[PDB]
Amino acid sequence: GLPWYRVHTVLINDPGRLIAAHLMHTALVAGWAGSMALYELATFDPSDPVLNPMWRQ
Amino acid sequence: QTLTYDDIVGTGLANKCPTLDDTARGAYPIDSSQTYRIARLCLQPTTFLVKEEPKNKRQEAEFVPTKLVTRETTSLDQIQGELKVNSDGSLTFVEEDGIDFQPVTVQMAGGERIPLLFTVKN
Ligand code: CLA
Ligand code: CLA
Ligand code: CLA
Ligand code: CLA
Ligand code: CLA
Ligand SMILES: CCCCCCCCCCCCCCCC(=O)OC[C@H](CO[C@@H]1O[C@H](CS(=O)(=O)O)[C@@H](O)[C@H](O)[C@H]1O)OC(=O)CCCCCCCCCCCCCCC
Ligand SMILES: CCCCCCCCCCCCCCCC(=O)OC[C@H](COP(=O)(O)OC[C@@H](O)CO)OC(=O)CCCCCCCCCCCCCCC
Ligand SMILES: CCCCCCCCCCCCCCCC(=O)OC[C@H](COP(=O)(O)OC[C@@H](O)CO)OC(=O)CCCCCCCCCCCCCCC
Ligand SMILES: CC1=C(/C=C/C(C)=C/C=C/C(C)=C/C=C/C=C(C)/C=C/C=C(C)/C=C/C2=C(C)CCCC2(C)C)C(C)(C)CCC1
Ligand SMILES: CC1=C(/C=C/C(C)=C/C=C/C(C)=C/C=C/C=C(C)/C=C/C=C(C)/C=C/C2=C(C)CCCC2(C)C)C(C)(C)CCC1
Numbered sequence: 001g002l003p004w005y006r007v008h009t010v011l012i013n014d015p016g017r018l019i020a021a022h023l024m025h026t027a028l029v030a031g032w033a034g035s036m037a038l039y040e041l042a043t044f045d046p047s048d049p050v051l052n053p054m055w056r057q
Numbered sequence: 058q059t060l061t062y063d064d065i066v067g068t069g070l071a072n073k074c075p076t077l078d079d080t081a082r083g084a085y086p087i088d089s090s091q092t093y094r095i096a097r098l099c100l101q102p103t104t105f106l107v108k109e110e111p112k113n114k115r116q117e118a119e120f121v122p123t124k125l126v127t128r129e130t131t132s133l134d135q136i137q138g139e140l141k142v143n144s145d146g147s148l149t150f151v152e153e154d155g156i157d158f159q160p161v162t163v164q165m166a167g168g169e170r171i172p173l174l175f176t177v178k179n
Contacts, residue, residue: 046167048111 072129074099089142095150098136100177105163107171123163123171131159133177152179 002009011018045052065071087093106120125131136155140148158176165171 051113 069129072101072132074101074132074134087142087148089146093140093142093148095136095138095140097134098138098150098152098155098177100133100136102131102161102175105161105173105175107163107165109165121165123165125161126164126170127160127162131161131175133157133159133175136177152177 008021011021044054044057060070105123105125107123108120109118111118134156136152136157138151138153140150142148157178158174160172161175162170162172
């Protein structure tokens, strides 16, 4: 069959499933951005923007 | 026009001090020969401020405003005591008894709760 590095080539002539794969990628990136922001909020110390700003943390 | 408990209950007015109308800009003569007392001292807090502690020793350590989380449980009321008239003409309230304490919890930014015994005990 297809080699491992060509598995996604099944989408080339399938616009509906290309859209679906792109939607899933978009869901993963948007889900990363939310989960990254929640991780940062859970750990950010906001109490000193002079000597402990976000870029030190 | 005087209210009852069923008018007041669950409205939050029980945590309020009584008010005097805007017209009452008068004056109350303290006869030095006669003794006085306080029938009711009410204190209704509106603003609780907590001083921050910046870890630096120096800096601007100002009082930050907080959010009350323990609801309308805050006023001290029904406080009684003797209002003495001193020798030099001054009046000294000595507090005797009353509802003179309320535990209060306020919350700073970041979620730190600050419990305090808001009081005028003695
Ligand atoms: C928009 C970016 C993009 C998209 C949509 C594609 C799409 C495609 N690539 Mg291409 N490619 C790209 C960028 C892209 N590529 C880049 C940046 C490189 C250099 C690294 C390549 C080098 C490349 C080669 C050499 C080949 C392809 C192939 C393909 C086709 C099949 C992919 C597959 O089945 O792998 C399936 C992948 C796996 C089963 C596992 C991959 C795991 C990788 C190695 C590490 C983990 C990645 C990680 C999970 C994701 C991080 C994302 C990152 C951007 C942050 C598909 C059309 C193949 C092709 O043309 O077939 C005819 C092929 O041979 N690509
Ligand atoms: C943006 C991500 C993405 C999307 C939308 C697709 C989409 C697709 N894949 Mg591809 N693929 C991907 C990434 C992706 N893939 C990665 C990272 C790998 C390497 C594991 C592959 C390897 C792969 C193979 C071998 C095959 C496909 C196939 C397909 C198609 C059918 C679905 C399927 O069987 O997947 C299979 C299921 C997966 C790939 C699940 C992903 C597994 C990774 C590890 C994520 C698991 C999540 C996990 C809970 C996270 C753990 C966190 C950790 C810190 C603990 C569909 C077009 C099939 C196909 O149609 O080929 C003809 C197929 O046979 N994919
Ligand atoms: C004229 C109307 C129109 C509009 C508004 C778009 C808009 C879009 N298309 Mg395109 N496209 C069009 C015509 C249009 N297209 C036509 C006629 C074709 C040929 C059939 C295509 C073929 C095409 C392909 C193959 C792909 C796109 C993709 C995209 C999206 C990329 C950006 C994205 O995902 O952001 C992020 C999304 C959001 C922030 C949310 C947006 C919410 C949407 C607008 C509303 C959802 C409800 C709505 C009823 C669903 C249908 C909308 C549809 C018309 C796009 C974007 C929504 C890509 C895609 O789908 O990526 C996932 C993609 O792979 N388009
Ligand atoms: C500009 C932004 C951008 C672009 C162009 C891409 C492009 C791509 N991403 Mg996406 N992604 C992005 C932002 C982007 N990403 C962000 C911000 C996130 C959140 C972290 C993701 C999360 C994400 C996931 C979870 C996945 C993708 C995948 C993909 C690939 C899908 C097509 C494919 O089959 O390639 C075929 C694969 C390749 C061409 C290999 C790409 C190699 C990359 C570029 C770098 C090499 C990584 C290295 C080998 C291993 C890293 C260390 C390891 C320990 C993880 C494509 C290369 C998917 C994928 O790779 O499927 C296999 C996939 O599963 N992305
Ligand atoms: C629906 C609308 C929407 C809105 C208002 C936001 C808003 C935000 N996003 Mg989110 N996001 C969204 C959808 C949205 N997002 C979707 C669908 C995804 C999945 C793809 C994400 C994935 C995502 C990630 C991974 C991250 C964000 C982040 C953010 C924050 C910073 C934005 C930023 O720096 O981008 C900068 C944007 C650009 C620089 C855009 C570049 C545009 C390029 C140059 C266009 C190039 C091609 C163009 C077509 C050329 C022709 C142009 C023509 C005019 C001539 C902001 C709160 C960041 C964050 O803080 O997360 C918590 C962040 O890391 N978002
Ligand atoms: C930590 C380990 C545990 C993690 C558990 C996570 C749950 C996943 C485990 C269960 C996997 C079940 C897949 C196999 C069942 C099935 O047949 O496939 C169901 C479908 C197709 O349906 C199918 O379609 C097929 C035909 S076709 O593909 O449409 O052509 C047909 O064969 C079939 O009858 C029909 O059902 O295929 C799949 O969806 C691809 C495999 C699932 C990949 C799992 C990825 C995890 C989900 C994404 C989570 C991140 C999202 C964040 C962004 C929002
Ligand atoms: C976030 C989630 C991430 C998902 C996890 C997925 C990660 C994917 C991992 C893929 C790795 C694939 C490796 C496939 C390996 C593999 O399958 O090779 C065989 C394959 C050749 O395949 P053909 O095209 O012959 O097809 C056969 C097919 O059956 C393959 O499916 O070659 C390639 O894949 C090209 C890459 C060359 C790589 C060869 C490297 C070997 C060198 C050894 C180096 C070590 C010694 C160094 C000493 C100095
Ligand atoms: C589609 C996947 C592509 C993988 C991206 C590789 C990025 C490498 C950087 C660029 C150097 C490229 C020179 C390649 C040379 C080249 O041009 O190759 C092209 C080749 C496809 O070529 P053809 O279709 O001609 O196939 C030749 C085969 O038939 C073998 O004879 O692509 C590969 O084989 C992709 C596999 C590379 C596999 C790389 C190993 C991935 C290891 C990942 C391990 C990750 C750890 C995972 C932890 C979770
Ligand atoms: C369904 C649904 C829902 C939910 C959703 C969710 C909850 C989601 C989540 C999501 C998420 C939570 C996601 C996340 C994602 C993530 C990712 C996607 C990541 C990625 C990663 C990577 C890619 C990395 C890589 C690396 C490493 C590992 C090391 C170093 C290097 C690098 C960085 C490259 C709701 C209810 C809302 C709505 C309705 C429906
Ligand atoms: C409709 C319906 C439903 C629903 C379903 C759904 C739709 C689901 C989905 C689900 C999902 C969709 C899931 C998801 C998952 C995810 C995950 C699992 C993720 C993970 C992630 C991670 C792991 C993270 C990490 C990180 C990052 C990325 C950055 C920052 C840091 C940290 C580390 C945090 C049900 C059945 C209920 C029932 C009824 C009907």
